[PDB]
Amino acid sequence: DVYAQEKQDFVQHFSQIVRVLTEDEMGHPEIGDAIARLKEVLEYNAIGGKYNRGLTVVVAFRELVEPRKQDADSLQRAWTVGWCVELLQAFFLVADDIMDSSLTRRGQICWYQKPGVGLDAINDANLLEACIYRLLKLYCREQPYYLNLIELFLQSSYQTEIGQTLDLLTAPQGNVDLVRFTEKRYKSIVKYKTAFYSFYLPIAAAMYMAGIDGEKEHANAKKILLEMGEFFQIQDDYLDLFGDPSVTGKIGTDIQDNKCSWLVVQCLQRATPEQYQILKENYGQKEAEKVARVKALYEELDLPAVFLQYEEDSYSHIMALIEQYAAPLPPAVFLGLARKIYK
Amino acid sequence: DVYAQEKQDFVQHFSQIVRVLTEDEMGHPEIGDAIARLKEVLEYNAIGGKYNRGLTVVVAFRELVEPRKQDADSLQRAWTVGWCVELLQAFFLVADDIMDSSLTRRGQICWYQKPGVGLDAINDANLLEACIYRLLKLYCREQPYYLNLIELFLQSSYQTEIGQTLDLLTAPQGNVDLVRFTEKRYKSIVKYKTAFYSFYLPIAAAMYMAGIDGEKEHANAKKILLEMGEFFQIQDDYLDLFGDPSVTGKIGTDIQDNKCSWLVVQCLQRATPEQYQILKENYGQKEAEKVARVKALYEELDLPAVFLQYEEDSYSHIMALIEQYAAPLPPAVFLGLARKIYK
Numbered sequence: 001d002v003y004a005q006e007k008q009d010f011v012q013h014f015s016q017i018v019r020v021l022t023e024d025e026m027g028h029p030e031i032g033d034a035i036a037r038l039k040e041v042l043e044y045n046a047i048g049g050k051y052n053r054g055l056t057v058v059v060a061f062r063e064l065v066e067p068r069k070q071d072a073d074s075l076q077r078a079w080t081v082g083w084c085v086e087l088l089q090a091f092f093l094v095a096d097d098i099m100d101s102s103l104t105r106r107g108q109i110c111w112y113q114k115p116g117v118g119l120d121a122i123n124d125a126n127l128l129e130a131c132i133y134r135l136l137k138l139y140c141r142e143q144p145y146y147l148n149l150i151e152l153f154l155q156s157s158y159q160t161e162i163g164q165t166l167d168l169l170t171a172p173q174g175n176v177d178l179v180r181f182t183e184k185r186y187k188s189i190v191k192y193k194t195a196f197y198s199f200y201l202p203i204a205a206a207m208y209m210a211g212i213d214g215e216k217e218h219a220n221a222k223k224i225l226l227e228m229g230e231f232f233q234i235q236d237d238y239l240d241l242f243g244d245p246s247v248t249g250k251i252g253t254d255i256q257d258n259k260c261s262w263l264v265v266q267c268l269q270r271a272t273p274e275q276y277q278i279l280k281e282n283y284g285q286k287e288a289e290k291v292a293r294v295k296a297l298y299e300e301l302d303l304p305a306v307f308l309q310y311e312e313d314s315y316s317h318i319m320a321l322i323e324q325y326a327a328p329l330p331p332a333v334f335l336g337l338a339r340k341i342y343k
Numbered sequence: 344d345v346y347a348q349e350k351q352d353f354v355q356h357f358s359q360i361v362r363v364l365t366e367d368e369m370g371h372p373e374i375g376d377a378i379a380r381l382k383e384v385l386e387y388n389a390i391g392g393k394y395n396r397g398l399t400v401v402v403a404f405r406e407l408v409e410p411r412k413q414d415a416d417s418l419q420r421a422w423t424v425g426w427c428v429e430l431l432q433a434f435f436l437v438a439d440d441i442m443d444s445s446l447t448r449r450g451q452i453c454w455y456q457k458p459g460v461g462l463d464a465i466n467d468a469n470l471l472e473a474c475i476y477r478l479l480k481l482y483c484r485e486q487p488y489y490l491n492l493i494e495l496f497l498q499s500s501y502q503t504e505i506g507q508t509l510d511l512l513t514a515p516q517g518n519v520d521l522v523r524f525t526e527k528r529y530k531s532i533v534k535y536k537t538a539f540y541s542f543y544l545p546i547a548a549a550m551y552m553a554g555i556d557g558e559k560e561h562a563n564a565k566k567i568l569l570e571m572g573e574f575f576q577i578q579d580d581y582l583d584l585f586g587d588p589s590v591t592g593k594i595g596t597d598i599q600d601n602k603c604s605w606l607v608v609q610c611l612q613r614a615t616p617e618q619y620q621i622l623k624e625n626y627g628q629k630e631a632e633k634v635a636r637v638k639a640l641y642e643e644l645d646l647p648a649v650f651l652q653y654e655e656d657s658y659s660h661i662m663a664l665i666e667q668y669a670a671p672l673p674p675a676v677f678l679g680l681a682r683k684i685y686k
């Protein structure tokens with residue numbers, strides 16, 4: 001709604017982002033081809049998603065900053081930082097698709113799977129990250145929140161990288177170990193690898209831009225947002241298997257990749273002894289026959305129904321938390337985001 | 344000499360770097376295994392090189408800061424930022440070895456070639472980068488140069504990433520094109536991919552720590568340092584082929600990887616028509632027979648003698664530049680570094 005009404009405006013601003021990124025260096029004609037590759041990397045990897053994270057920066061900014069202080073420059077900075085969150089996303093996704101050996105993303109072939117690209121995508125990803133800070137310097141260098149934003153983007157990256165490390169350590173290829181797939185480990189993984197950058201980061205950025213830098217306020221917002229992020233990742237694990245790749249834009253790999261997904265953890269909590277052996281024998285392997293076996297067992301344990309139930313209970317819990325912690329911020333801030341990821 | 348007398352002190356400080364990096368998070372026991380992977384990544388990829396870049400921060404700091412202002416905290420920050428440059432190095436090298444399909448580094452198997460690691464090394468690299476800014480926040484958060492250092496490390500990364508992009512664009516696998524291997528393109532590649540982070544960055548960091556933030560002074564230092572960096576990369580290209588892997592610690596891949604190396608550019612400038620065809624037929628291929636062919640032609644054109652001559656002429660030019668641009672900085676600053684990479 002508020003996201004939907006802002007989407008088009010947000011996207012149209014992408015041309016300027018690209019222009020300022022592919023101009024401030026073109027005064028150095030020697031790197032021209034590199035700059036041209038950068039544009040290509042940006043168009044392919046920053047466009048095509050839902051932009052919920054970037055839009056959140058924009059929406060939250062408008063709801064937190066008094067309209068008398070929302071000048072043209074002020075708004076420009078807001079959707080610029082919104083695009084910075086979108087680039088952090090792109091950066092992690094490009095690397096993540098390589099490390100998960102994924103095939104498609106956002107309804108097109110993964111960048112690293114594009115003939116001509118391959119492992120060069122590693123450097124491409126690093127460039128996407130560098131661009132965040134180019135844009136911050138360009139548009140916010142003079143703002144009082146400049147250092148707060150820089151540290152917030154860096155901190156959020158470290159956290160999601162710590163989370164990725166957990167994600168990958170818990171999922172050795174060729175090493176089946178159902179034993180390590182617990183609730184505790186799962187909660188810790190998703191907290192770091194998704195919850196900070198996808199939910200805390202955008203709202204926290206808008207808070208700093210609105211002059212809201214108070215520690216307690218940020219902690220209170222974080223309380224709500226991390227819990228939403230946990231829900232979001234669990235929903236992401238569900239879609240990996242039970243979602244239509246025509247709508248998700250991506251092919252699942254979690255079972256093949258031996259991941260500590262929410263599905264397998266829930267499967268293990270409901271698994272009879274015989275079922276456990278079926279899981280242990282077919283999990284984390286590339287064979288389509290064995291993956292199908294795992295899915296069949298998930299469906300035999302009504303995990304699809306268990307997810308529908310979790311989603312409702314979780315949503316109610318998020319709402320409760322918003323009632324508790326939203327103040328003094330507008331509740332619409334969190335309600336708007338929550339509405340966007342519900343089901 | 345001054346580098347040598349400082350080496351041991353510098354290295355011994357690595358234990359503390361690791362401790363502070365693997366402690367400030369251990370208050371979060373949930374990420375403990377990730378933190379343990381981080382320690383493992385740090386020990387394997389930050390140790391074993393010459394530490395010329397880190398040592399430069401330390402040496403330059405001592406020569407630029409008045410001894411009355413070199414308190415214990417002040418020195419601690421200096422070798423900490425020195426280790427930050429070393430981590431930037433590690434970060435790029437881990438990714439670079441993957442993208443160049445290299446086998447060894449610093450006399451051991453490349454991290455990504457270690458059984459158990461593979462492409463997870465992409466995230467490991469990203470962690471090494473994140474650590475730079477953790478350490479900066481930890482030890483320099485209160486210093487007046489804090490934001491200058493942060494932007495200097497970010498800018499230097501963007502530049503070396505732009506350079507890597509040039510390095511990789513000019514070297515498509517399976518796509519031989521001697522035509523693109525020119526002097527101009529070479530100078531532009533090495534300027535961005537090596538010269539900034541390996542030579543300007545360390546000295547510039549010590550300058551900001553010594554309160555020397557003046558634009559003209561930094562530009563003047565940059566004039567000297569980029570030219571040294573060009574020399575250093577050219578020396579690196581020479582060693583890739585004509586160096587002993589027992590001393591370099593790495594196996595060459597430039598010819599196989601179809602790289603715009605200094606050797607091939609010099610070969611092309613001296614290549615008779617028939618020799619050109621030999622180059623075009625055997626360059627950028629994995630076959631050991633064809634690589635040997637390229638090397639034979641390099642030796643037929645006395646490129647080893649041409650490098651020895653370039654090194655002398657270049658060294659004299661660097662010295663000239665130091666005479667011109669060193670002031671008001673101690674010349675020992677640049678002489679010390681130059682002495683360290685001579686031959």
Ligand SMILES: O=P(O)(O)C(O)(Cn1ccnc1)P(=O)(O)O
Pocket residue numbers: 092096097100102193194236237240
């Ligand atoms: O399931 P993953 O965590 O790999 C994923 O959600 C990406 N990701 C990576 C960190 N956080 C999220 P994706 O399903 O989009 O491949």
Ligand SMILES: O=P(O)(O)C(O)(Cn1ccnc1)P(=O)(O)O
Pocket residue numbers: 435439440443445536537579580583
């Ligand atoms: O020759 P490269 O530039 O790949 C190298 O010098 C690494 N590097 C990467 C950027 N700058 C330098 P290395 O020979 O150590 O593999």
Ligand SMILES: [Mg+2]
Pocket residue numbers: 096097100102
């Ligand atoms: Mg993935």
Ligand SMILES: [Mg+2]
Pocket residue numbers: 096100167
């Ligand atoms: Mg992943």
Ligand SMILES: [Mg+2]
Pocket residue numbers: 236237240
């Ligand atoms: Mg997923």
Ligand SMILES: [Mg+2]
Pocket residue numbers: 439440443445
């Ligand atoms: Mg290399």
Ligand SMILES: [Mg+2]
Pocket residue numbers: 439443510
């Ligand atoms: Mg390289």
Ligand SMILES: [Mg+2]
Pocket residue numbers: 579580583
């Ligand atoms: Mg080399």
